[PDB]
């Protein structure tokens, strides 16, 4: 496993940008302006800015426009001239945004500053129907501001690990030290590894490029089981082991001779899967069985509901 696949750099970080905008076209299916006052008000503001002042008292019952919120991911080291993808979601009661156009919406950060400008054409999917009130614009937003960064300054860079682990951090530090000079890396906690790099943006970039593609083996993480209970999904880690026990569940019985099926001790995932399958049950019954088993022991893993 590569360092880039399981670690992130301290200075590299994404930000969230949000903005309000209007979508035109739509062949009808737009917002009902009677129930969406902000749509008409924003359209009037745009018209007044462009040079048209509609009288305050007017009908303004249009159906080819929809008020939308546009969300974007400000990427790390964003440049002024670069472009990013945006997601446009209907705000009022618009039926669909099939072939709409997003018009010059300013994308701002949490500080209320305009960081991008988004404009373009929405693309939406054409019984599992697609979401017609939410679309994506590729390269629809152009950056306007650049976030200052400290990258290239100092002599220490922090590699941050997803799903922190003391063994994982130790392995990363050992790999970095073996590849680079002695004492190049030092683990600060279960999630942070401080690496010494020479001063200078170019030198730091070269060091990070060398480190990121480094190959590090992944030690056994933990015996973990995930139960959705909302999508009807159950997933077990390769480290899950099952202790000998007897389980009785409603309508479940020995194939053959009745209830109270025996569960043999299983050390590996294959044995655990075979024993659970022999204890024949649907995933919904399996969730309850696993919960009861973990409550009573007999399950050498931690199970979480997602």
């Amino acid at each position: 496993e590569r360092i880039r696949d399981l670690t992130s750099v301290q200075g590299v970080r994404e930000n969230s940008l949000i903005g309000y905008g209007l979508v035109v076209g739509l062949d009808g299916t737009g917002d009902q302006t009677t129930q969406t006052p902000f749509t008409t008000q924003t359209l009037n503001n745009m018209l007044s800015q462009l040079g048209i002042t509609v009288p305050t008292g007017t009908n303004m019952q249009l159906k080819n426009v929809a008020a939308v919120m546009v969300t974007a991911s400000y990427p790390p080291f964003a440049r002024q001239g670069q472009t990013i993808d945006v997601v446009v979601s209907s705000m009022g009661n618009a039926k669909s945004l099939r072939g709409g156009t997003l018009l010059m919406t300013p994308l701002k950060g949490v500080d209320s500053q305009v960081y991008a400008l988004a404009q373009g054409n929405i693309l939406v999917g054409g019984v599992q129907v697609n979401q017609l009130n939410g679309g994506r614009i590729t390269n629809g937003a152009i950056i306007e501001r650049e976030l200052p960064t400290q990258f290239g300054a100092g002599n220490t860079i922090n590699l941050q690990l997803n799903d922190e682990d003391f063994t994982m951090a130790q392995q990363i530090t050992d790999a970095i030290n073996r590849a680079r000079g002695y004492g190049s890396a030092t683990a600060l906690d279960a999630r942070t590894v401080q690496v010494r790099v020479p001063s200078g943006n170019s030198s730091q970039v070269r060091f990070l490029a060398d480190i990121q593609n480094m190959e590090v083996n992944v030690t056994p993480q933990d015996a973990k089981v995930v139960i959705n209970s909302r999508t009807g999904s159950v997933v077990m880690n390769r480290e899950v082991t099952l202790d000998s026990c007897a389980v009785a569940q409603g309508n479940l019985s020995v194939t053959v001779g009745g209830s109270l099926q025996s569960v043999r001790s299983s050390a590996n995932l294959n044995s655990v899967v075979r024993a659970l399958n022999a204890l024949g049950a649907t995933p919904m019954d399996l969730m309850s069985i696993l919960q009861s088993m973990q409550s009573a022991g007999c399950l050498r893993a931690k199970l979480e509901i997602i």
């Binding site: 200075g11 590299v12 970080r13 930000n15 969230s16 400000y74 790390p76 950060g109 949490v110 500080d111 500053q113 960081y115 976030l147 200052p148 960064t149 400290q150 990258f151």
Partner: protein
Amino acid sequence: CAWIPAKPLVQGATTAQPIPGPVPVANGSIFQSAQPI
């Protein structure tokens, strides 16, 4: 008399000048804390 000096019960300045706040830290995040109390 109405011209005798008097001190209104609401003493002190009736105005507060807003503080500009703390300069952002170049940590790469748009979000900036505000010194939690």
